[PDB]
Design a protein around this nucleic acid. Sequence first.
DNA 1: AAAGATATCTT
DNA 2: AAAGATATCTT
Lengths: 227, 240
Amino acid sequence: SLRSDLINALDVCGIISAEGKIYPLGSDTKVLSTIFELFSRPIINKIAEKHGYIVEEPKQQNHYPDFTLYKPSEPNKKIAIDIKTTYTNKIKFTLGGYTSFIRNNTKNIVYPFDQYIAHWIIGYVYTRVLKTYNINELNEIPKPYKGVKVFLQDKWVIAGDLAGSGNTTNIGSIHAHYKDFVEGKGIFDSEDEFLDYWRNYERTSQLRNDKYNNISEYRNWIYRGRK
Amino acid sequence: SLRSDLINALYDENQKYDVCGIISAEGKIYPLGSDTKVLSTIFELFSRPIINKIAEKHGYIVEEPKQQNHYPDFTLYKPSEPNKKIAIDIKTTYTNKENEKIKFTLGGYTSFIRNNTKNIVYPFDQYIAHWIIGYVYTRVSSLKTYNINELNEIPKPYKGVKVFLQDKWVIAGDLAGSGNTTNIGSIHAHYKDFVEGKGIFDSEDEFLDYWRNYERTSQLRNDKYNNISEYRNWIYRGRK
DNA sequence: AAAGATATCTT
DNA sequence: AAAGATATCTT
């Protein structure tokens, strides 16, 4: 399938100029996120093409998702792929905001949310370890990571019940080992529960203390009649 | 000076080079996307070696943050004069056409400027200057990988990079650059005004005072000040 | 944990 | 404009 294929298809050491000069990579996530993103684009486009899918990136810069795949024939069977990165020296990711397109069908999203039948997360985890180089020195350039693991999984399967960020209201993923994301050992019973829980999550602790702050509390809140 | 050398070095390097991809230790090159999150990572990468070459030529040691979320990108100083540090942050923004106005986000106004030790590599009071290297690019196949034998084949996602170096306080504006992340917004103007230094604050003390007292929301800024004129009046009356 | 800091963009 | 979106991190 498009899925098993992308998963099968999934060492960068620097940026290069049209004149051959090579600049080394930085050690932070802001840098590795960008790298992994560009590393993945050709892979995604290769596999999508194989399967007759069109790949589309956002024109407005703060729109979800990173990649939108679909066959011009079936407009409502669109797929969303977002690339997430974190490091190790148990990992956790920030999975997008919870007050946007999930609460509002067209808010900050390339196509209306209801046209997307799948929402995949390609996750990269890297283990953390000032001179330009020339093409002939490629093998001596120090890399800013010891290793790199990648996985493809459904967003709902890996989402957790605690916020990933405060002021930028992001969904937190489960806090677990790499295996668990690969295997999909989540906390939510279905994609419907995942969506309901985040559509009703309050922004601050004081506002959540009267509703719920975790999955057990949300279930007891469903019982009380959503009041 | 360190300043004039650095500006010439950046300016020169930018005229002569053109970043077109990321490369693997095995020689495969991946193309660049055309969104600022990417181009700003690239520009910071392109800048590091130059910044270090010039600082070395003047006796300055260069340090990068140990944690993500600590200002600035680069701390320069002499081992003999520790308490005279220089802060440099790289900022990026794009334009849809050359000449049109631009503006940058310049960091929070609720962190180190308000709390001398919050989110900064060294206590705020050890820096004698805060510089900004700004990159402006015009937004503009790129889905396949290339080999070294095709470096000049790979298309670029930008039309005309411009770079400038200027003091933060000089280019800072009076309206916030962001809401939830409480950023200082720069002046909104033409690239020349950034180069020339056509700002709004009279001094670096004014800039810091305006930003140390700027309220987080319109509602609270009603009874205070929402712009430079109002700040001056506020000041005139005794900050009441 | 929860909250807020490093980061630009819309509209 | 202001406010709040796409980025992960730290305490």
